[PDB]
Amino acid sequence: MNAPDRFELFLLGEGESKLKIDPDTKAPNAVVITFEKEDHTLGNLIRAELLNDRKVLFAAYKVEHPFFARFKLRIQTTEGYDPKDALKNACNSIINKLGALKTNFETEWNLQTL
Amino acid sequence: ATLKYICAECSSKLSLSRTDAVRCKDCGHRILLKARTKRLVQFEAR
Amino acid sequence: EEGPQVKIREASKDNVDFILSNVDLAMANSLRRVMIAEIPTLAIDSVEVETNTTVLADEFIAHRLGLIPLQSMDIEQLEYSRDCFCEDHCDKCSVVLTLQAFGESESTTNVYSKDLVIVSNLMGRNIGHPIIQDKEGNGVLICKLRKGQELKLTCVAKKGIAKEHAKWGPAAAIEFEYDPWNKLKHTDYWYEQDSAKEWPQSKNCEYEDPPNEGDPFDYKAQADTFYMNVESVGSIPVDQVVVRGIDTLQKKVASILLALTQMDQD
Amino acid sequence: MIVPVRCFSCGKVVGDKWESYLNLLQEDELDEGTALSRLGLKRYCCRRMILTHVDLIEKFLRYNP
Amino acid sequence: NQEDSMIMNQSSIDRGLFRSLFFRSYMDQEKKYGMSITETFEKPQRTNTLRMKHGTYDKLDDDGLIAPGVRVSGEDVIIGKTTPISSKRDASTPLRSTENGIVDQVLVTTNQDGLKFVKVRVRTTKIPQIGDKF
Ligand SMILES: [Zn+2]
Ligand SMILES: [Zn+2]
Ligand SMILES: [Zn+2]
């Protein structure tokens, strides 16, 4: 009755952009990206790959309140490196890793006979 | 065929007017139930 | 071959048992999550009831109709109603099904998922067919009728995901385990006498070398090699739950880049 | 009321498996444990779904209308 | 789940976990004030000075009752009745303001006296929500 629409969980609202990038005032060369209509499905995964980047000095994410599907991702990188680029690269790295996992599953499934 | 009321026991479609005896045709039973709209009701499969 | 390798153990029309090696835990889990929650299926979403003489409430039956598995193999050919251009629904965005049953027998008359009949045009795609898995080939038992007990209704099946209602759950329980010998010290096993004796051994203990007392703690050790087991409800074949699982998770990470690029237009 | 379509916990379809569960117990004379197992109800979440279900529908059908 | 509260699996709730039905029966009678002066179950309208309710009378049929299929809400008039004064004054039954549902069963019988008696049952499916008790 006071319950939200189930679809709001993934469907962007009026003027809701998937990303909102804000600079972290508190630290040098640091950013805070608000991912709207998302969860740990994507957040934990992006943070993990961001952590693989040598040039990434800081990477964390939080789901401030469970009522709303959104997360803030904080990225601090070495000087002369846009955190946007660290995330840009960390994303490709996930897709490429997954593209390999698809093909190598399809290979192993075609090999099966049952 | 016209549908207004149904019997509870014998369950014979009755269809009677305002002040036309609350009893049922066949069995002398005073227990009656209403039709159900021809206004097709919709639900969410959730 | 390239990067994260998959090693299938057992395979069936219902279960896929495999070993996911050379991956990051977060990835194996995020796939796990996607597999359940975000793969699109087709299930009934609108039930318009014409006539009901059942001992069962209109909405009760309505609920059950959603829960019934329906074919989703070629779900990509069907549009999500929301994005379709029609007033409510059409053949491009929906599958219409009709259920009509009556107690013609003196005995109890049963209503099953086989009793549904597609009234919309399928445009050739394998979609909207109620999934039947049982020996007798009746499918899910919706309800039971008497004599004058009649049931007539219309169903509008739509594209959707578990984040909306678990009725669009292409997957049942997904099994997930790693480091059966707790070498990573990820768990501190509760005990009364012996830690190892009290806690049962896993099947996956065969597929990993035990540590041998004399060896010191590997702190450099990181979590890779995840023993997983997917279970299809039937909507989409088991393999495609793992494949579409990968594809959906990709589409997502990609959509971030797509939107990151649109931000660099202003 | 009537055999639920799918186990609450994991979503495994237990709705079809009812009539066969009754036959395995009556006709085949199997025990409730082996019956559920033969039907392929592996984890206990689904086992409870069928094993602990009460099919009241049969009692409601008994009333005349 | 802190301090005697709990977390519930929504994917389970969806599948129909802890889901319940709910019914409420509303009742009315055509009272006889003296002799031949009787109340009448009908769908009333703006005729002289009747103090009619602020709900939807449109859901009532000519008999002054809802058909047992319709979805009723707020203060929607579920029993239309009128008492005369010496034209007509309203004696209708709205739904409980704090409630909503679908008309489940309307029962039209006679009271021992020989006057019109009616009972209206309304159905609602209640789903385990965030502040619900267990
Ligand atoms: Zn009768
Ligand atoms: Zn359409
Ligand atoms: Zn289960």
Curated annotation (Swiss-Prot), chain A:
Phenotype upon changing residue 108 to K: Transcript termination readthrough. Lethal
Give the SUPFAM superfamilies listed for this entry.
Answer: RBP11-like subunits of RNA polymerase (SSF55257)
Kindly indicate whether the keyword Nucleus belongs to this entry: yes
**What Gene3D superfamilies does the record point to?**
RNA polymerase, RBP11-like subunit
Residues that span the membrane, as ranges: none
Q: Has UniProt tagged this entry with the keyword Transcription?
A: yes
Q: Where mainly found?
A: nucleus
What's a Pfam family this protein contains?
A: RNA_pol_L_2
Tell me where in or outside the cell this protein is found.
Nucleus
Instruction: Tell me which stretches of the chain form a coiled coil.
Output: none
Q: Name one GO molecular function term.
A: protein dimerization activity
For biological process, the GO terms are: RNA-templated transcription; termination of RNA polymerase II transcription; transcription by RNA polymerase II; transcription elongation by RNA polymerase II; transcription initiation at RNA polymerase II promoter
Which keywords, in A-to-Z order, does the entry hold?
A: DNA-directed RNA polymerase, Nucleus, Transcription
Its quaternary organisation is: Component of the RNA polymerase II (Pol II) complex consisting of 12 subunits.
Misc. remarks from the entry: Present with 4280 molecules/cell in log phase SD medium.
Show the PANTHER family listed in the entry.
DNA-DIRECTED RNA POLYMERASE I,II,III, DNA-DIRECTED RNA POLYMERASE II SUBUNIT RPB11
Q: What name does the UniProt record give this protein?
A: DNA-directed RNA polymerase II subunit RPB11
- Organism equals Saccharomyces cerevisiae (strain ATCC 204508 / S288c) (Baker's yeast)
Lineage, top ranks = Eukaryota, Fungi, Dikarya, Ascomycota, Saccharomycotina
Swiss-Prot record, chain B:
Protein name (database record): DNA-directed RNA polymerases I, II, and III subunit RPABC4
Q: Which gene underlies this protein?
A: RPC10
Q: Which residues of the full protein are shown?
A: 25 to 70 of 70
Please list the disulfide bridges: none
What does the UniProt PTM comment say about this protein?
A: The N-terminus is blocked.
Where does it live in the cell?
Nucleus, Nucleolus; Peroxisome
Q: Which residues take part in binding Zn(2+)?
A: 7, 10, 24, 27
Extra remark: Present with 907 molecules/cell in log phase SD medium.
Question: Would you kindly state one Gene Ontology biological process term found in this protein's UniProt entry?
Answer: transcription initiation at RNA polymerase III promoter
Tell me if Metal-binding is a UniProt keyword of this record: yes
Q: One MF term from GO for this chain?
A: DNA-directed RNA polymerase activity
Gene Ontology CC terms, in alphabetical order: cytoplasm; nucleolus; nucleoplasm; nucleus; peroxisome; RNA polymerase I complex; RNA polymerase II, core complex; RNA polymerase III complex
Keywords, A to Z, come to: DNA-directed RNA polymerase, Metal-binding, Nucleus, Peroxisome, Ribosome biogenesis, Transcription, Zinc, Zinc-finger
UniProtKB/Swiss-Prot annotation, chain C:
Q: Where is the signal peptide?
A: none
- Does this entry carry the keyword Acetylation? yes
Which compartments is it annotated to reside in? Nucleus
**Swiss-Prot/TrEMBL keywords:** Acetylation, DNA-directed RNA polymerase, Metal-binding, Nucleus, Transcription, Zinc
Give GO terms: molecular function aspect only: DNA binding; DNA-directed RNA polymerase activity; metal ion binding; protein dimerization activity
Give me the disulphide-bonded residues.
Answer: none
Q: Which domain of life is it from?
A: Eukaryota
One of the GO BP terms on file? RNA-templated transcription
* Chief localization: nucleus
Does this UniProt record's set of keywords contain Zinc-finger? no
What does UniProt give as GO cellular component? Answer: nucleoplasm; nucleus; RNA polymerase II, core complex
Record note on what altering residue 7 to E does = Transcript termination readthrough
Query: What positions does the entry give for Zn(2+) binding?
Result: 84, 86, 90, 93
Instruction: Family membership, please give it.
Output: Belongs to the archaeal Rpo3/eukaryotic RPB3 RNA polymerase subunit family.
Instruction: Explain the purpose of this protein.
Output: DNA-dependent RNA polymerase catalyzes the transcription of DNA into RNA using the four ribonucleoside triphosphates as substrates. Component of RNA polymerase II which synthesizes mRNA precursors and many functional non-coding RNAs. Pol II is the central component of the basal RNA polymerase II transcription machinery. It is composed of mobile elements that move relative to each other. RPB3 is part of the core element with the central large cleft and the clamp element that moves to open and close the cleft. Seems to be involved in transcription termination.
Q: How does it assemble?
A: Component of the RNA polymerase II (Pol II) complex consisting of 12 subunits.
Q: What else is known?
A: Present with 10000 molecules/cell in log phase SD medium.
Name-wise, this protein is: DNA-directed RNA polymerase II subunit RPB3
What's the encoding gene here?
Answer: RPB3
From Swiss-Prot, chain E:
Q: Which residues bind Mg(2+)?
A: 4
Q: Where in the cell is it found?
A: Nucleus
Segments traversing the membrane: none
- Detail the disulphide connectivity of this chain as listed in its UniProt entry: none
Q: At which residues is Phosphoserine found?
A: 86
* Coiled-coil positions: none
The role this protein plays is: DNA-dependent RNA polymerase catalyzes the transcription of DNA into RNA using the four ribonucleoside triphosphates as substrates. Second largest component of RNA polymerases II which synthesizes mRNA precursors and many functional non-coding RNAs. Proposed to contribute to the polymerase catalytic activity and forms the polymerase active center together with the largest subunit. Pol II is the central component of the basal RNA polymerase II transcription machinery.
The family annotation for this protein states: Belongs to the RNA polymerase beta chain family.
Q: What else is known?
A: The binding of ribonucleoside triphosphate to the RNA polymerase II transcribing complex probably involves a two-step mechanism. The initial binding seems to occur at the entry (E) site and involves a magnesium ion coordinated by three conserved aspartate residues of the two largest RNA Pol II subunits. Present with 18700 molecules/cell in log phase SD medium.
The subunit field of the Swiss-Prot or TrEMBL record says:
Component of the RNA polymerase II (Pol II) complex consisting of 12 subunits.
Q: What is this protein called?
A: DNA-directed RNA polymerase II subunit RPB2
* Name of the encoding gene: RPB2
